[PDB]
């Protein structure tokens, strides 16, 4: 039997599924450590590796990209978990090696590949404390080209009045996602700042792991693909909506939580986002 992880229910993805919308024909690039394409609860449609010493994007030597992919798009069947957008066309864009790290140029090359290959959504469950001009230009180019770009806010917690959101989440063109638990409480590690845009579940999130396994991970890395998967659901119901419109639909229909410094606009609600008329619940 398949299980629906709590976070998929919490963002109201089953309401889209019951309307008949599951992300079909939407192309989502998981820009990350690879995706294990042999997992029976994932279908990987394509991809490319930008990591010089790990040339196979369908081999995930870390596990992180596989877990993130399962939250976006684990298949709807009688096994494992159910993804937010279980019919999405999933692309493994490997820019991180086994140790979880990548050079800025590798991430940028992955973003460029996504643009050249007409991806509809990019998820980046990754970041660092400093930006670069070339990084900002790559994310700005993807957004100018029509791509919805979603990233983890970072796990830097609080630091008085200072923002702790990492890059590329911290750029205005990217939707930065923080983490809440099943009670809608912000996770203590979740980054904060005026750049925090929305929140999604990021505590004890069950998903796919390499070698046909499953497990619970924590992080804004886990929250980001709820929002990337939500963007795919929205585009499957409204295939002509632009990235501008998908982004506003998610922002304008959150359930507001606390102060925006800590919670942004609140928890995403993809049922409300995918209606024509938007308001907060």
């Amino acid at each position: 039997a398949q299980s629906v992880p709590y976070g998929v229910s919490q963002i109201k993805a089953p309401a889209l599924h019951s309307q008949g919308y599951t992300g079909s024909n939407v192309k989502v690039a998981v820009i990350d450590s690879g995706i294990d394409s042999s997992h029976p609860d994932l279908k990987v449609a394509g991809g490319a590796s930008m990591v010089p010493s790990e040339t196979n994007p369908f081999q995930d030597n870390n596990s992180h990209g596989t877990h993130v992919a399962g939250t976006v798009a684990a298949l709807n069947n009688s096994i494992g978990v159910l993804g937010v957008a279980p019919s999405a066309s999933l692309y493994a864009v490997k820019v991180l090696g086994a140790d979880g790290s990548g050079q800025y140029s590798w991430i940028i090359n992955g973003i460029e590949w996504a643009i050249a290959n007409n991806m509809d959504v990019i998820n980046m469950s990754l970041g660092g404390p400093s930006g670069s001009a070339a990084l900002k230009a790559a994310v700005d180019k993807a957004v100018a080209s029509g791509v919805v770009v979603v990233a983890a806010a970072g796990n830097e917690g609080t630091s008085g009045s200072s923002s702790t959101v990492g890059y590329p989440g911290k750029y205005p063109s990217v939707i930065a996602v923080g983490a809440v638990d099943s009670s809608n409480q912000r996770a203590s590690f979740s980054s904060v700042g005026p750049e925090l845009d929305v929140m999604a579940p990021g505590v004890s999130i069950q998903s796919t792991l390499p070698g046909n396994k499953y497990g619970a991970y924590n992080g804004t890395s886990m929250a980001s693909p709820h929002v990337a998967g939500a963007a795919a659901l929205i585009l499957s119901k409204h295939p002509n909506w632009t990235n501008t419109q998908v982004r506003s639909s998610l922002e304008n229909t959150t359930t507001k939580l606390g102060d925006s410094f800590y919670y942004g606009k609140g928890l995403i609600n993809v049922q409300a986002a995918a209606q024509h008329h938007h308001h907060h619940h």
């Binding site: 990548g102 590690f189 890395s221």
Partner: protein
Amino acid sequence: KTEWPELVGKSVEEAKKVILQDKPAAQIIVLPVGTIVTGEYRIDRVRLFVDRLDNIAQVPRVG
């Protein structure tokens, strides 16, 4: 203890020694400063970001 600001500018060797006294089961990974990394939270992990001289270039923290 979950952050070590006093270790910035020390050698990676001294940082490892100090962190393992405070947190003996720590999983320490050394990475170049200015790389991009996965955004998952691992309570057992301490990443150490080093400059090209192998000195600590960013405050080590659990995660």
